[model samples]
Target: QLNPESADLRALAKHLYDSYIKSFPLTKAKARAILTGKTTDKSPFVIYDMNSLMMGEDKISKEVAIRIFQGCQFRSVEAVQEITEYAKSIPGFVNLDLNDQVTLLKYGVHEIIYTMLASLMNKDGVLISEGQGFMTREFLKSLRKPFGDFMEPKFEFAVKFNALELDDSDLAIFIAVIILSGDRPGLLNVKPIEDIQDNLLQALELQLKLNHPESSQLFAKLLQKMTDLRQIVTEHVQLLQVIKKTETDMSLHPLLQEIYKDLY
Candidate 1:
């Protein structure tokens, strides 16, 4: 329903959403911090803005929620440009036509974006700045309905998904398969896309074993997150349509709006 009138916009949006997701890895700095055995490092103690919320200043308005949401949505455009370069860096992703590429992206973008959210998020909340304010899991949920419900489940997704301790390269290959999922509608080609999942999953499994040998069920548990991720996106699409129809105060960024505007 929200397809761009211009072929140029369509091309750009497809390119943007497909690879914008790949930027999740550029955020690998924190992973390295944790990898350096600072798993015990607590943001509440170190990050200053985290302390402000603790001093009874935790009343976040719907306006600021919209702003933070827009901030991430705005920052996502650059994430797209960065994601696209690596999106093309893969072996077989470019084989699909542009329209097929766009469809895959439209469906998978939400799942992958939340999947990447695991990187920037903590069990407390998502870190919304350059090591500054981290929203609380309960705090964001305590706010208005539209934006609150938006994050409640995502924080759950992030905390569990973050437990896998995947770094940039691990996420790099994982998100590649996400956008290339054959289950998404509007595909003209099936087998090549399906084959990509095959190759991608095998490679992913191998990497998991090498990186997480102690945890026997780790790979399978992560796969369950993929299943849950789809459901999360499905429900979010429903909430978005309601927010569009009802909540006039919350403005969706256009490109982000484009990807979400059509799904029922």
Candidate 2:
């Protein structure tokens, strides 16, 4: 609906979004397998342990949950690195003042990570890690403290967001919109950032229209998902604060720790 008048910029955005969609690792089939606990021969982790079940050792422990969280956090960091490099490759993004670029990434990475997670999740509320282990919502909630509370909201949002049935193309533009947000605390040039966001939103709306013509409200629903994403990130930050104080053994990556510091 809001295509940039400049044909070059329009085409550039389209190319960028297309490349991003193609590079995204998760597919619906993979997400389904991850959610259903259906193990494939090629899977890296042995998801189902018949022996554990037979021995009544099906319960996941706090140590196990911590390990799962670490794996998930590591994957999330890898994704952030991938998307950050992709953004930098885009024509105008890398040219931004260094401080503005860092600020935007610092504020937006968690939101983008959670948005991407929504695609990998399902109503079953479990995310598979490295194709091996399942990070169950139930197990997370069973943690020693309410440490799992921090992650529950993201899973809840994912279930609802997944109900929208967005495709890869829709997600590419949606992720772009999340990353290009202009409202971060220390942006030096809001207008340029907003301009990029406007083009992305317009592109996303157009794609949603083409992708879901039968659903008149899908675009609005996606916008609401972004709002929910921000709220989820806020809750995640709160949880991180508590974890930093109490969960001394939890090994957070330095990049994530830095982002958490900036977020607070």
Using lDDT as the measure, which candidate wins? 2
Question: For each candidate, what TM-score against the reference?
Answer: 0.75, 0.82
Best by TM-score: 2
Q: Give per-residue lDDT, candidate 2, residue 62.
A: 50
lDDT of 2 by residue, 1-264 (tens): 444454554565478666775565665556666556576553333233333322333332456556556766888788778778767755567778888888888887788788778766655445454344444466556655645575689889988888888876677677777778888887889988888888877777777776689988898888888779888888887777777788887779998888888673
lDDT values of the candidates?
Answer: 0.65, 0.70
Q: Per-residue CA lDDT of candidate 1, range 182-240, in tens?
A: 87777888888898777666666666665678879776787787887888888887877
Candidate 1 vs. true structure, TM-score: 0.75
RMSD of 2: 4.3
Worst 10 residues of 1 by lDDT: 42-51
